[PDB]
Design a protein around this ligand. Structure first.
Ligand SMILES: C[S@@+](CC[C@H](N)C(=O)[O-])C[C@H]1O[C@@H](n2cnc3c(N)ncnc32)[C@H](O)[C@@H]1O
Ligand SMILES: C[S@@+](CC[C@H](N)C(=O)[O-])C[C@H]1O[C@@H](n2cnc3c(N)ncnc32)[C@H](O)[C@@H]1O
Ligand SMILES: C[S@@+](CC[C@H](N)C(=O)[O-])C[C@H]1O[C@@H](n2cnc3c(N)ncnc32)[C@H](O)[C@@H]1O
Ligand SMILES: C[S@@+](CC[C@H](N)C(=O)[O-])C[C@H]1O[C@@H](n2cnc3c(N)ncnc32)[C@H](O)[C@@H]1O
Ligand SMILES: [Mg+2]
Ligand SMILES: [Mg+2]
Ligand SMILES: [Mg+2]
Ligand SMILES: [Mg+2]
Ligand code: NA
Ligand code: NA
Ligand code: NA
Ligand code: NA
Ligand code: NA
Ligand code: NA
Ligand code: NA
Ligand code: NA
Lengths: 341, 341, 341, 341
C-alpha cells in the first residue's frame, strides 16, 4: 500500500534537494552569472550567453531550476536575482570553498574509508579562493585586531599559505606603509593571487611566490618581515609533516627573525564536544569542516595542543583572541599573537 | 561591524550543511555501513572496520559527523542508527541515484555551460542501481497495474534499460510463470543485474544482456516477448538519437512483435509549470531531475509529445495511468500501456 | 541515559519555536512597531516606548527575542529591522488573519471537540482586517479580472462582508467614476472600514453599513448596484444559515437586481485531495484554513457544489477563474462571474 | 504583476504553518487522543469519538489536518500515529507547558506592552503539569545527581512549587524509604499532584498542600525535612516578592532547619549572550522562555546573581552542576546544592 509514503519521502530527501541547490548556487557564483545579474539587474538567457560565452538551452535550464527555488525572478525582459538571491551575495566564499574546493573530497569518502586507500584529494585552488572570501568576515578582522595589540607596528608582512592574497590586499590597502610577500603552494591559487594583487594596483608593494611554507623558510631571500601570518596553515603542515616538523618550522622562524611577531589562526578541534556542536554555526560549518579534516592530509588539534606546540618551539603568547561574536560566536576560530620567548 | 552577520550566515549556508549531509548519507548506504548497523544494532568502529575492511580514524570521523547530525547514537558499546537514521532506510535509491549517479553531473554544470563543452557525464552504474531502488516504490507498482489491464497475460517479458534488473526480479518472484530478458548498456549496471538475478535464485528464468535498446532490437534472437517494458529509457534514446530514431525504434518493436504489449514509463516535462513545481515532491525531486536533463544527453518531453510519438509509430493507447498518490501525487510520472494500431 | 535526546528535542519542539515566532511577528505588525521601525530606521526601546506608549523592559524583551531570531539588528543607537525583518512586510495580512483572528480558534479546538461544545469563536475584527490585507494580492486582482470580462461598465458596486472595505478602496482608486456601498456585520471590522474609507478620502463616494448580507438584501434602499462582490462570504452564510438560505439569498439578489453581475470568490474544499495538499501553499495556508472551517460556523464546499447552488438559484456562469499563478497556484481559490439565467 | 510572490509567501508564512501545527500537537496530547492512538494502534473517528465523548466532524477535521502534515496515517480501518507522530511522544511536557500554559501569555504581549497594562497571565495548571513532564528528562536527573553528592541520606523530602508532584513520585519510587511533602499554590496543579500521587499508590508516603512557598515556611508543622527542592521556583518568588523577600525566605529555611540540604534549580539569564543564544536548544526553548519571563511576574537572573543571594542568606555552596549534555548542553539550567554556612 505504501500508505503515507510520499510525505515521508519529501522529508527524507530534503538533504538531496538542498545538495543540488548548494551546487547550483556555487555555479551561479563561480561562473560569474551572479556578478552578471548584479550588473545587468535583468538579463535574458541570450544576453548572459553572449557575455559569458555560454549555451542558451543549458543556461535556461539552470535559470528555470533557480527560479523554481526562488533564487531568481523571471519577467518578459529576462531573469533577475530575487531578494533571496541578492541575500546570498556575502556567502560566496563558503560556497566556493566547501562546494568548489571540497565537493570531490566529500564524494571520495566512501572509497577513502578502505584500508590503505590514502587521503581524499580536493581542488586546492577553490579551497584557497573560497577561504580568502570567508576570511574577509572572520579571520582578517581577527588578524587586524591581533596586529594592533603587538608592541611593534607592521612594516613588512609575510603571509604563508596566502590563497589568492586577500589578507595582503586588505592589509595593504588599509595600511599604505606595508610591503608584503605571500607564498601559496597551489599553482591555481598562486595565479589568482598574482591577478588579485595586480587588479588591486598593489604589484609594486606585494610579491607572491609559488611555494609551500616550510620550503619558503628554507629558501634564500633578503626580505626581513616584522610580522608573519599563518592563517589555517599550521594544521596542514601538522597533518602533512608531523608535530616535530611543525615545532622545527616555528623554531626556524624565530631563529631567522628573532624580533618577529607571529599571528597564527587555527580552528580548535571540538568535534567531540556535545555542547559546542549544537551551535548553529558549529553544525552548518564546523561539523563538515571537522569531517573533511578526517579524510584529508590535515590535522586539527585543540587550543591547548597549539599552546603546547608554541611553548616547545620557544614562543611566548602575547595575546589570544577569538572572532567577533557578530560573525562567529562558536569560540572555535582562535588567533594567537606570539613572539620569541 | 558586520552586525547580525552570523545569524544570516547560518541560514545562508544551510544548503551547504545539507549538501554534506546528503553525501554522507549516500556513503552510509553505498559502503554497506547502513546495512551493517541494521544487522549489528550497535557496532564499535573496530568491529565495522574489521567487517568492511575500513580504517578506524576515518570511520570514527564519519560516525562522529553523523552523530552530531542525529543520524547515529553513540554509547560505550559503539554506534547505532538513531530513530531518524532508521527512518532513512526506504530512501536509499534516491541517494544512490542523485548523489552516487548524478553528483559529478551537477558539479560539471559550470564547465558544461560553455559554448561547445558537450554533455555532462554521470556514473550510469549508480544511476541504474539507484533508479531501480526508487522503482520499487513508484514505477514497478505502476507497471504491475498496467500489465493487469492488458488483454493478454504476460509469459515472456523484455526489459530494455533494466539497470540492476529489479523489475525482472520483482515480476518473476510475484509471477512464477514468467521468463524474462533484460538489456542494460552500462557495464557496471549489467554486472549488478547478473548478480541480483543470481542472488534471487532466478538465473534459470531471467537472462541479462550487456546492450543498448536500439542495438538489442537490431540483434538476432529467438525470444518472443509478449510484453516489453521501457522504464525511463525512451527519453534517453530521444536525447541520444533524436525523434525519428525513437519513432523508428517503436515501429521496429511492433514490426518484429505485432502482438506485443508495450509498457512505457516517462516523466512529463512540466519544468516551466508554476503550479506543478510548488508540490513538495516536484521541488525535492523533479526540479533537480529536470535540471540534470538539461545538461545530459537525455531529453524529457510532455505527455502530449509522447502520445504524438506513439501515434506516429503506429501504436494505440490501451490505457494511461500515473503513480499511486500514496507515493508520488505530482501526476508527472506517467505509464502508458500500448499495442500495435 | 537519554543518549542523543537533545538533538531529537531541538527538532521535536521546532513547531513550538516557530509558534512563538509567529505570535511575536503578529504583535510586531499589530502594535505598529513594524511601521515605527520602517519610519525611524533605527529606534532605541526608549524612543519606541515614548511614541507608542509602551513599557521599556517588556519592549526590550520582545526586541531581544526578535534579534536572537534575526528579525531585528541591534547597534549602539538601537534596534532596526534586518533584511529578513523587512522581507516580512507583505505578509502582514496573513499574520493578522491567522494569528490575530484565529489564534483563539485553534486554541479552543481541544474543548470544542467535546460533544455539544459548540463552535469555536474567533476575533472577527482581525479576521476581516487580515483577510482584506491578503486580498490585496490574490482576491482583488481576481475580482478585477472577472469584472473586466463582464458586459458593460461598473458604476455602482456593492460589497457584502466587506471587512475593512479594502476592495472598495482599491476599486474606487482604479475606477474614479464608481460609487460603492459595503456591508460588514462585525462591529470592529465595520469601524475599521469607515476609518479606511475616510483615511483614503473616499467618504463622499463610499458608504459602509453595519449589517449582515441577508439582512442587507432584505433592507430598504434606493442604491441600484450593477455589481455585487461576495468575497469568501457565501460559505459563512452556508454554515450559519444552511443551503436553502444561500439559494434563497442568491435568488433574492437577481429578483431585486435582474441585470446585476455577481462576482463570488470561494475556496474549493480539497482537504481530502492528496495531490492538492502537497503544494507548499496548500500546506502553509489551506491545511490550517480547512481545519479552522471544521471548528467554526462556516462550511467550505467543492467547486461542483457551488456550481450546483448557482444553477438552483437561477444563475448562469459567465466565466470562472482561479488566482494568478504568481501569487497562488493551488487552483483552490476560485472566482465566478455570474448573471441571472 | 507580483512576480515570484507565491514562493516568497510560502516561506514568509512558514512560522504560521508551524504555529497551527504546534497547537494541534498540543491538543493531540492534551485531549488524550495521542494516548488513545497508542492503545488502539488504528482508530476510526467514530471509535475515538465514542471513547472520548467527541464530535465526529470536528475530530475528522483535526485528523485530516494531521494526516496532511504526516503526523497520522489513514487506512480503510481508520487513523494511526505515523513514525513521525510516534516520535513526538517524549516532547509532551514542552507542548503542555509552552502551548497549554503559555499560549495565552504570548498572545497577550501586544496589549501587555502598553504602559500600566500589568503582567500577562498564564494557565499555571498547564505550566506546572508541563514543567513536571519536562523535568523527567533534565531537572529530576540533575536533582538526583546533586542529592547523591550531599552528606548522609535523604529520608524526608520537601518540594515547594511541586507542580503535579512528579519529583516526589520519581524520588519515592527510586528511594522506597523516604516520606515526602509537596506544596503547590496553583489549585489545578495541586489537584493534579494529589491525583498523580494517588495513581502511583503513594498517598501513604506523600502529602500535598495547596500553598505558596513563603506561606508554607511560615505555617506550623512537625515534618523535619533533611532536603528541600526549589525547582524553578525562586525566580517566581523573586519576581512576585522582590530580592529582600527571597533572601529572607532562604534565611527562614536554614533558621528552621539548620541541618537541611537545599537543592535549587534555576535558569541562568543569558538572553543577551550572542554565543549562548545560537545553540539550537537556546533558540528553540530558552529564547521563548526568556521572552515569557519579561511579560510575567517572574524574574530570571544570572548564575552570579544567584550565588550572591545564597551568600547573603547565609548559605554555602556544596556543589553546582548543569544538566547532562545528552539532554540539555546549553549550560543554562543550573542546580545548586547548598547548606547553612
Ligand atoms: C585553508 S586555506 C587558508 C588561506 C588563507 N591563509 C586564509 O586564512 O583564508 C590554506 C591554504 O594554505 C595552503 N597550504 C597548504 N599546505 C601548505 C604548506 N605546506 N605551505 C604553505 N601553504 C600551504 C593551501 O594551498 C591553501 O591555500
Ligand atoms: C533512469 S534508469 C531506469 C532504470 C529502470 N528501467 C527503472 O525504471 O528504474 C535508465 C537506464 O537506461 C539505461 N540506458 C541508457 N541509454 C540506453 C539505451 N540507449 N538503451 C538501453 N538502455 C539505456 C541506463 O544505463 C540506465 O540503466
Ligand atoms: C473571510 S472575511 C472576507 C473579507 C473580504 N470580503 C475579503 O474578500 O477579503 C469574511 C467577512 O464576512 C463577514 N461576514 C460573516 N458572516 C457574514 C454575513 N452573514 N453577512 C455578511 N458578512 C458576513 C465577516 O465578518 C468577515 O468580515
Ligand atoms: C516552572 S513550574 C516548576 C515545577 C516543578 N518544581 C519542576 O521543577 O518541574 C513553577 C511552579 O511553582 C509554582 N509557584 C509559583 N509561585 C510559587 C510560590 N510563591 N510558592 C510556591 N510555588 C510557586 C507554580 O504554580 C508552578 O507549579
Ligand atoms: Mg584546513
Ligand atoms: Mg533519465
Ligand atoms: Mg471563511
Ligand atoms: Mg518560571
Ligand atoms: Na575559515
Ligand atoms: Na587528517
Ligand atoms: Na523514477
Ligand atoms: Na538534454
Ligand atoms: Na483569503
Ligand atoms: Na464548519
Ligand atoms: Na524546565
Ligand atoms: Na518578569
Amino acid at each position: 500500500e505504501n500508505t503515507g509514503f510520499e510525505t515521508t519521502l519529501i522529508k527524507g530527501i530534503e538533504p538531496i534537494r538542498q545538495f543540488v541547490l548548494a551546487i547550483s548556487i556555487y555555479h551561479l557564483f563561480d561562473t560569474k552569472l551572479f556578478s552578471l545579474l548584479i550588473k545587468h539587474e535583468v538579463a535574458s538567457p541570450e544576453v548572459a550567453c553572449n557575455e559569458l560565452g555560454m549555451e542558451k538551452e543549458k543556461l535556461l535550464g539552470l535559470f528555470r531550476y533557480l527560479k523554481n527555488e526562488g533564487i531568481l525572478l523571471e519577467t518578459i525582459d529576462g531573469f533577475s536575482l530575487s531578494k533571496e538571491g541578492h541575500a546570498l551575495a556575502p556567502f560566496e566564499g563558503w560556497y566556493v570553498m566547501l562546494v568548489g574546493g571540497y565537493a570531490t573530497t566529500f564524494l571520495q569518502m566512501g572509497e577513502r574509508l578502505q584500508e590503505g586507500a590514502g587521503w581524499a584529494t580536493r581542488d586546492a585552488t577553490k579551497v584557497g579562493v573560497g577561504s580568502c572570501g570567508i576570511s574577509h568576515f572572520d579571520a582578517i578582522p581577527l588578524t587586524r585586531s591581533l596586529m594592533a595589540q603587538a608592541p611593534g607596528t607592521c612594516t613588512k608582512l609575510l603571509d604563508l599559505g596566502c590563497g589568492n592574497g586577500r589578507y595582503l590586499a586588505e592589509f595593504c590597502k588599509a595600511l599604505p606603509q606595508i610591503q608584503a610577500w605571500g607564498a601559496e603552494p597551489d599553482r591555481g591559487g598562486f595565479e589568482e593571487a598574482v591577478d588579485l594583487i595586480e587588479k588591486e594596483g598593489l604589484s609594486h608593494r606585494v610579491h607572491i611566490s609559488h611555494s609551500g611554507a616550510v620550503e619558503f623558510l628554507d629558501s634564500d631571500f633578503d626580505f626581513e618581515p616584522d610580522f608573519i601570518v599563518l592563517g589555517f596553515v599550521l594544521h596542514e603542515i601538522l597533518g602533512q609533516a608531523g608535530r616535530p616538523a611543525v615545532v622545527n618550522f616555528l623554531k626556524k622562524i624565530v631563529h631567522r627573525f628573532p624580533a618577529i611577531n607571529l599571528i597564527i589562526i587555527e580552528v580548535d578541534n571540538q568535534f567531540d564536544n556535545a555542547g559546542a556542536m549544537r551551535h548553529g554555526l558549529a553544525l552548518a560549518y564546523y561539523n563538515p569542516y571537522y569531517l573533511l579534516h578526517c579524510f584529508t592530509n590535515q590535522l586539527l588539534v585543540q587550543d591547548a595542543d597549539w599552546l603546547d606546540i608554541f611553548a616547545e618551539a620557544g614562543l611566548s603568547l602575547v595575546t589570544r583572541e577569538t572572532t567577533s561574536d557578530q560573525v562567529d560566536s562558536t569560540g572555535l576560530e582562535i588567533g594567537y599573537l606570539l613572539r620569541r620567548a
